[PDB]
mmCIF file of C-alpha atoms and ligand atoms in Angstrom:
data_model
loop_
_atom_site.group_PDB
_atom_site.id
_atom_site.type_symbol
_atom_site.label_atom_id
_atom_site.label_comp_id
_atom_site.label_asym_id
_atom_site.label_seq_id
_atom_site.Cartn_x
_atom_site.Cartn_y
_atom_site.Cartn_z
ATOM 1 C CA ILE P 1 91.587 163.986 53.183
ATOM 2 C CA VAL P 2 95.015 165.707 53.834
ATOM 3 C CA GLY P 3 98.200 163.538 53.661
ATOM 4 C CA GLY P 4 96.238 160.488 52.410
ATOM 5 C CA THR P 5 96.606 158.055 49.470
ATOM 6 C CA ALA P 6 94.243 156.713 46.767
ATOM 7 C CA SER P 7 91.995 153.770 47.786
ATOM 8 C CA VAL P 8 91.350 150.782 45.431
ATOM 9 C CA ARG P 9 87.950 149.288 44.381
ATOM 10 C CA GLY P 10 86.244 147.344 47.229
ATOM 11 C CA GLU P 11 88.733 148.661 49.891
ATOM 12 C CA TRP P 12 86.040 150.664 51.845
ATOM 13 C CA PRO P 13 82.766 149.058 50.676
ATOM 14 C CA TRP P 14 80.645 150.775 53.440
ATOM 15 C CA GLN P 15 81.758 154.260 52.174
ATOM 16 C CA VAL P 16 79.008 156.094 50.177
ATOM 17 C CA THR P 17 78.914 159.479 48.378
ATOM 18 C CA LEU P 18 75.737 161.502 49.085
ATOM 19 C CA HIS P 19 74.901 163.833 46.145
ATOM 20 C CA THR P 20 72.610 166.819 46.094
ATOM 21 C CA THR P 21 70.956 167.632 42.748
ATOM 22 C CA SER P 22 69.962 171.278 43.440
ATOM 23 C CA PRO P 23 70.826 173.453 41.715
ATOM 24 C CA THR P 24 73.417 171.117 40.153
ATOM 25 C CA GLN P 25 74.459 167.501 40.913
ATOM 26 C CA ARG P 26 77.546 167.299 43.164
ATOM 27 C CA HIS P 27 79.017 165.447 46.153
ATOM 28 C CA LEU P 28 77.659 166.833 49.463
ATOM 29 C CA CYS P 29 78.910 164.453 52.185
ATOM 30 C CA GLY P 30 80.228 160.978 52.958
ATOM 31 C CA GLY P 31 78.183 158.279 54.685
ATOM 32 C CA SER P 32 78.408 154.670 55.856
ATOM 33 C CA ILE P 33 76.237 151.620 55.035
ATOM 34 C CA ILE P 34 75.046 150.223 58.409
ATOM 35 C CA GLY P 35 72.008 148.211 57.187
ATOM 36 C CA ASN P 36 70.362 147.166 53.899
ATOM 37 C CA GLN P 37 68.155 150.338 54.025
ATOM 38 C CA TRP P 38 70.296 152.556 56.298
ATOM 39 C CA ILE P 39 73.107 155.155 55.848
ATOM 40 C CA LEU P 40 74.765 156.789 58.883
ATOM 41 C CA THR P 41 76.046 160.352 58.211
ATOM 42 C CA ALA P 42 76.376 163.824 59.838
ATOM 43 C CA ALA P 43 73.293 165.988 60.649
ATOM 44 C CA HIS P 44 75.111 169.207 59.465
ATOM 45 C CA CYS P 45 75.114 167.810 55.844
ATOM 46 C CA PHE P 46 71.399 168.753 55.524
ATOM 47 C CA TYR P 47 71.651 172.526 56.237
ATOM 48 C CA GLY P 48 69.632 174.004 53.328
ATOM 49 C CA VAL P 49 68.671 170.556 51.851
ATOM 50 C CA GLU P 50 64.989 171.465 51.112
ATOM 51 C CA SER P 51 63.851 167.796 51.249
ATOM 52 C CA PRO P 52 65.100 164.240 50.601
ATOM 53 C CA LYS P 53 63.728 164.576 46.982
ATOM 54 C CA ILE P 54 67.037 166.207 45.817
ATOM 55 C CA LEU P 55 69.353 163.552 47.399
ATOM 56 C CA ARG P 56 71.014 160.592 45.678
ATOM 57 C CA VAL P 57 73.073 157.921 47.512
ATOM 58 C CA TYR P 58 75.829 156.273 45.427
ATOM 59 C CA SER P 59 77.442 153.034 46.705
ATOM 60 C CA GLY P 60 80.279 151.050 45.205
ATOM 61 C CA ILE P 61 81.959 154.266 43.874
ATOM 62 C CA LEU P 62 85.767 154.662 43.802
ATOM 63 C CA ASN P 63 86.002 157.641 41.367
ATOM 64 C CA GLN P 64 83.374 160.495 41.268
ATOM 65 C CA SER P 65 83.967 160.426 37.462
ATOM 66 C CA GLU P 66 82.274 156.913 37.377
ATOM 67 C CA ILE P 67 78.895 158.609 38.045
ATOM 68 C CA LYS P 68 76.962 159.213 34.751
ATOM 69 C CA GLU P 69 73.257 159.801 33.932
ATOM 70 C CA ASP P 70 72.535 155.987 33.886
ATOM 71 C CA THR P 71 74.561 155.173 37.092
ATOM 72 C CA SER P 72 72.217 153.507 39.628
ATOM 73 C CA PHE P 73 71.702 155.288 42.978
ATOM 74 C CA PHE P 74 69.408 154.883 45.984
ATOM 75 C CA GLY P 75 66.610 157.352 46.565
ATOM 76 C CA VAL P 76 66.225 158.691 50.137
ATOM 77 C CA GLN P 77 62.875 157.902 51.820
ATOM 78 C CA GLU P 78 63.571 159.821 55.061
ATOM 79 C CA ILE P 79 66.259 161.956 56.738
ATOM 80 C CA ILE P 80 66.355 161.314 60.533
ATOM 81 C CA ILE P 81 68.392 163.990 62.349
ATOM 82 C CA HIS P 82 69.001 163.630 66.107
ATOM 83 C CA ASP P 83 66.326 165.744 67.925
ATOM 84 C CA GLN P 84 69.018 167.555 70.044
ATOM 85 C CA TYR P 85 71.172 168.583 67.013
ATOM 86 C CA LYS P 86 71.675 172.378 66.519
ATOM 87 C CA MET P 87 75.268 172.734 65.196
ATOM 88 C CA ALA P 88 78.212 170.312 64.462
ATOM 89 C CA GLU P 89 80.523 171.855 67.122
ATOM 90 C CA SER P 90 77.701 171.460 69.806
ATOM 91 C CA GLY P 91 77.438 167.660 69.204
ATOM 92 C CA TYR P 92 74.545 165.267 68.285
ATOM 93 C CA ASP P 93 75.962 165.569 64.720
ATOM 94 C CA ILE P 94 74.329 162.340 63.510
ATOM 95 C CA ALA P 95 71.694 161.466 60.917
ATOM 96 C CA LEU P 96 70.218 158.329 59.366
ATOM 97 C CA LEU P 97 69.099 158.131 55.757
ATOM 98 C CA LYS P 98 66.382 155.541 55.188
ATOM 99 C CA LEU P 99 66.742 154.363 51.553
ATOM 100 C CA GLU P 100 63.705 153.775 49.320
ATOM 101 C CA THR P 101 64.860 150.125 48.778
ATOM 102 C CA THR P 102 67.394 147.586 50.201
ATOM 103 C CA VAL P 103 71.129 147.524 49.210
ATOM 104 C CA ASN P 104 71.992 144.018 47.887
ATOM 105 C CA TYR P 105 75.454 143.553 49.447
ATOM 106 C CA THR P 106 78.321 142.786 46.942
ATOM 107 C CA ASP P 107 82.168 143.002 47.021
ATOM 108 C CA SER P 108 81.722 146.769 46.332
ATOM 109 C CA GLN P 109 78.869 147.632 48.860
ATOM 110 C CA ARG P 110 78.971 146.108 52.359
ATOM 111 C CA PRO P 111 77.818 147.168 55.832
ATOM 112 C CA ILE P 112 80.148 148.239 58.659
ATOM 113 C CA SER P 113 79.459 146.974 62.237
ATOM 114 C CA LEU P 114 78.577 149.405 65.053
ATOM 115 C CA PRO P 115 80.792 149.290 68.161
ATOM 116 C CA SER P 116 79.521 147.265 71.237
ATOM 117 C CA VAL P 117 88.475 148.651 73.808
ATOM 118 C CA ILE P 118 91.581 150.720 72.794
ATOM 119 C CA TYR P 119 91.403 151.296 68.974
ATOM 120 C CA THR P 120 94.951 151.546 67.482
ATOM 121 C CA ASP P 121 94.089 150.986 63.742
ATOM 122 C CA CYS P 122 91.713 153.856 62.724
ATOM 123 C CA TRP P 123 91.231 155.233 59.182
ATOM 124 C CA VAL P 124 89.407 158.274 57.788
ATOM 125 C CA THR P 125 88.189 158.147 54.158
ATOM 126 C CA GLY P 126 86.493 160.470 51.674
ATOM 127 C CA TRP P 127 86.566 162.667 48.530
ATOM 128 C CA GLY P 128 87.277 165.893 50.514
ATOM 129 C CA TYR P 129 89.931 168.590 49.953
ATOM 130 C CA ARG P 130 93.679 167.736 50.266
ATOM 131 C CA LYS P 131 94.181 171.294 51.768
ATOM 132 C CA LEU P 132 91.943 174.132 53.163
ATOM 133 C CA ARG P 133 91.376 175.839 49.699
ATOM 134 C CA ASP P 134 91.115 172.953 47.163
ATOM 135 C CA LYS P 135 88.385 170.883 45.349
ATOM 136 C CA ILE P 136 86.493 167.559 45.754
ATOM 137 C CA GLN P 137 88.887 164.672 44.780
ATOM 138 C CA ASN P 138 88.009 162.184 42.000
ATOM 139 C CA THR P 139 89.451 159.110 43.774
ATOM 140 C CA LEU P 140 88.407 158.092 47.355
ATOM 141 C CA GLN P 141 91.346 158.915 49.707
ATOM 142 C CA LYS P 142 92.351 157.160 52.982
ATOM 143 C CA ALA P 143 94.573 158.140 55.937
ATOM 144 C CA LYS P 144 95.442 156.325 59.184
ATOM 145 C CA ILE P 145 94.962 158.657 62.211
ATOM 146 C CA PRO P 146 95.600 158.090 65.927
ATOM 147 C CA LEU P 147 92.795 158.687 68.434
ATOM 148 C CA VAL P 148 93.545 161.351 71.084
ATOM 149 C CA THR P 149 91.965 161.485 74.586
ATOM 150 C CA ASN P 150 88.907 163.740 75.178
ATOM 151 C CA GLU P 151 91.116 165.461 77.850
ATOM 152 C CA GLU P 152 93.788 166.311 75.182
ATOM 153 C CA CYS P 153 91.051 167.304 72.647
ATOM 154 C CA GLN P 154 89.330 169.776 75.065
ATOM 155 C CA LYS P 155 92.758 171.467 75.721
ATOM 156 C CA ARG P 156 93.020 172.117 71.929
ATOM 157 C CA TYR P 157 89.411 173.469 71.624
ATOM 158 C CA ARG P 158 88.965 175.770 74.667
ATOM 159 C CA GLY P 159 86.206 177.717 72.765
ATOM 160 C CA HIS P 160 84.035 174.556 72.511
ATOM 161 C CA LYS P 161 82.454 171.930 74.811
ATOM 162 C CA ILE P 162 84.161 168.559 73.977
ATOM 163 C CA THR P 163 81.894 165.827 75.478
ATOM 164 C CA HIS P 164 82.161 162.011 75.811
ATOM 165 C CA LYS P 165 79.749 161.985 72.786
ATOM 166 C CA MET P 166 82.696 163.212 70.626
ATOM 167 C CA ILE P 167 85.981 161.467 69.780
ATOM 168 C CA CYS P 168 89.061 163.257 68.420
ATOM 169 C CA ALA P 169 91.818 161.980 66.113
ATOM 170 C CA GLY P 170 94.988 163.582 64.750
ATOM 171 C CA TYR P 171 98.789 163.810 65.021
ATOM 172 C CA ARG P 172 100.378 166.378 67.423
ATOM 173 C CA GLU P 173 102.484 167.596 64.432
ATOM 174 C CA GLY P 174 99.432 167.559 62.048
ATOM 175 C CA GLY P 175 99.857 166.421 58.396
ATOM 176 C CA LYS P 176 96.940 163.869 58.093
ATOM 177 C CA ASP P 177 93.237 164.792 58.709
ATOM 178 C CA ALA P 178 89.746 164.968 57.272
ATOM 179 C CA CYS P 179 89.098 168.180 55.274
ATOM 180 C CA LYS P 180 86.168 169.933 53.512
ATOM 181 C CA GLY P 181 83.842 167.334 51.844
ATOM 182 C CA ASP P 182 84.896 164.429 54.126
ATOM 183 C CA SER P 183 82.127 165.179 56.700
ATOM 184 C CA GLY P 184 79.523 162.459 57.260
ATOM 185 C CA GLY P 185 82.033 159.765 56.243
ATOM 186 C CA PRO P 186 83.401 157.100 58.593
ATOM 187 C CA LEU P 187 86.240 156.860 61.089
ATOM 188 C CA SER P 188 86.635 153.071 60.665
ATOM 189 C CA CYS P 189 88.734 151.109 63.246
ATOM 190 C CA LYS P 190 89.833 147.499 62.721
ATOM 191 C CA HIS P 191 89.652 145.441 65.957
ATOM 192 C CA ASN P 192 90.168 141.604 65.947
ATOM 193 C CA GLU P 193 90.188 141.923 62.080
ATOM 194 C CA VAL P 194 86.609 143.320 62.203
ATOM 195 C CA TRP P 195 85.904 146.916 61.048
ATOM 196 C CA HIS P 196 83.867 149.057 63.511
ATOM 197 C CA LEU P 197 82.272 152.448 62.727
ATOM 198 C CA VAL P 198 83.811 154.356 65.658
ATOM 199 C CA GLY P 199 83.365 157.949 64.363
ATOM 200 C CA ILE P 200 81.426 160.149 61.932
ATOM 201 C CA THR P 201 83.603 162.943 60.414
ATOM 202 C CA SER P 202 82.120 166.143 61.946
ATOM 203 C CA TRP P 203 84.301 169.279 62.395
ATOM 204 C CA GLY P 204 87.625 170.817 63.312
ATOM 205 C CA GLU P 205 89.795 173.930 63.116
ATOM 206 C CA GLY P 206 91.203 174.043 59.546
ATOM 207 C CA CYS P 207 92.667 170.718 58.221
ATOM 208 C CA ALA P 208 95.736 168.735 59.477
ATOM 209 C CA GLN P 209 97.059 171.720 61.574
ATOM 210 C CA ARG P 210 99.432 171.016 64.509
ATOM 211 C CA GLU P 211 97.569 170.366 67.827
ATOM 212 C CA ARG P 212 94.115 170.718 66.143
ATOM 213 C CA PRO P 213 92.695 167.168 65.903
ATOM 214 C CA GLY P 214 89.599 166.311 63.829
ATOM 215 C CA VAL P 215 86.403 165.955 65.887
ATOM 216 C CA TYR P 216 84.076 162.982 65.190
ATOM 217 C CA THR P 217 80.670 161.905 66.468
ATOM 218 C CA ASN P 218 81.425 159.060 68.990
ATOM 219 C CA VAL P 219 79.135 156.408 67.385
ATOM 220 C CA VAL P 220 79.157 153.988 70.413
ATOM 221 C CA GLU P 221 77.305 156.732 72.470
ATOM 222 C CA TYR P 222 74.460 156.703 69.816
ATOM 223 C CA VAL P 223 74.023 152.909 69.341
ATOM 224 C CA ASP P 224 70.769 152.880 71.402
ATOM 225 C CA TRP P 225 69.500 155.881 69.310
ATOM 226 C CA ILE P 226 70.424 154.092 66.025
ATOM 227 C CA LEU P 227 68.748 150.782 67.100
ATOM 228 C CA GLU P 228 65.566 152.672 68.196
ATOM 229 C CA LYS P 229 65.341 154.408 64.772
ATOM 230 C CA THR P 230 66.327 151.317 62.631
ATOM 231 C CA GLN P 231 63.674 149.227 64.500
HETATM 232 N N1 LIG B 1 89.642 168.944 59.751
HETATM 233 C C1 LIG B 1 88.288 168.531 60.136
HETATM 234 C C2 LIG B 1 87.306 168.552 58.939
HETATM 235 C C3 LIG B 1 86.060 167.775 59.355
HETATM 236 C C4 LIG B 1 85.148 167.791 58.147
HETATM 237 C C5 LIG B 1 84.744 169.186 57.788
HETATM 238 C C6 LIG B 1 83.739 169.201 56.595
HETATM 239 O O1 LIG B 1 83.858 168.496 55.589
HETATM 240 N N2 LIG B 1 82.712 170.051 56.742
HETATM 241 C C7 LIG B 1 81.688 170.166 55.695
HETATM 242 C C8 LIG B 1 80.530 171.010 56.206
HETATM 243 C C9 LIG B 1 79.450 171.065 55.267
HETATM 244 C C10 LIG B 1 78.837 169.906 54.785
HETATM 245 C C11 LIG B 1 77.789 169.965 53.869
HETATM 246 C C12 LIG B 1 77.330 171.193 53.403
HETATM 247 C C13 LIG B 1 77.941 172.364 53.866
HETATM 248 C C14 LIG B 1 78.988 172.306 54.793
HETATM 249 C C15 LIG B 1 82.250 170.806 54.410
HETATM 250 O O2 LIG B 1 82.968 171.804 54.499
HETATM 251 N N3 LIG B 1 81.811 170.218 53.277
HETATM 252 C C16 LIG B 1 82.080 170.653 52.006
HETATM 253 C C17 LIG B 1 82.867 171.751 51.665
HETATM 254 C C18 LIG B 1 83.078 172.069 50.309
HETATM 255 C C19 LIG B 1 82.490 171.338 49.271
HETATM 256 C C20 LIG B 1 82.739 171.639 47.976
HETATM 257 N N4 LIG B 1 82.135 171.122 46.903
HETATM 258 N N5 LIG B 1 82.710 171.665 45.802
HETATM 259 N N6 LIG B 1 83.678 172.494 46.215
HETATM 260 N N7 LIG B 1 83.708 172.457 47.567
HETATM 261 C C21 LIG B 1 81.687 170.242 49.609
HETATM 262 C C22 LIG B 1 81.488 169.953 50.957
HETATM 263 C C23 LIG B 1 85.975 170.014 57.401
HETATM 264 C C24 LIG B 1 86.881 169.999 58.602
#
């Protein structure tokens, strides 16, 4: 996250860190708890993941440095990528992880509601870079970002097809954005004091550049897909 601040424990309890363990253990992508057995993330995260056997889902993490050899994690039973997905920039950038067992919800691990509205209180969160050439951050970062219209977003990405299945967010002057390692995490919007998972962090041109908003999977356009897959 560029131009963000440190989160505190329990601030974003639906935020997970998805680790790969091949050839070494490291953060791969963010994700969001949407059900006791269900993580919503980006399809692109799984490019060259050989199978779910190498994945570990960590919930209730603030600092990456908390994760040791005895730290509990969830195994991944199944990766469900949208059948029309080919590439992040071409949309359908959405995936479910079915966990091997149920998350018992606590102060530190809680589900986020799907959307059913003008969202004015939207936040992007993750352990990603603070600038284009950087490293994964120890402490989960947060930044408040304004949504932009799909009409404005298309004008900034004339090499790409921006559809109603995408939502864009960013400042005209730049300064705050998702960056490398934030993908798959949530764009969380608070509406009537309830948090909604409005976006999944997907792609963009660089990080926090002027007139280059972040592009997110528009979760409300996939609610029927999610409900079909989650039963
Ligand atoms: N301004 C809009 C932003 C929107 C999110 C974008 C993003 O995050 N894309 C992923 C793609 C990706 C995900 C997973 C695997 C390969 C590639 C990505 O780049 N991840 C990534 C990179 C680097 C490390 C890494 N680990 N250690 N050092 N670097 C770890 C994950 C950046 C643009």
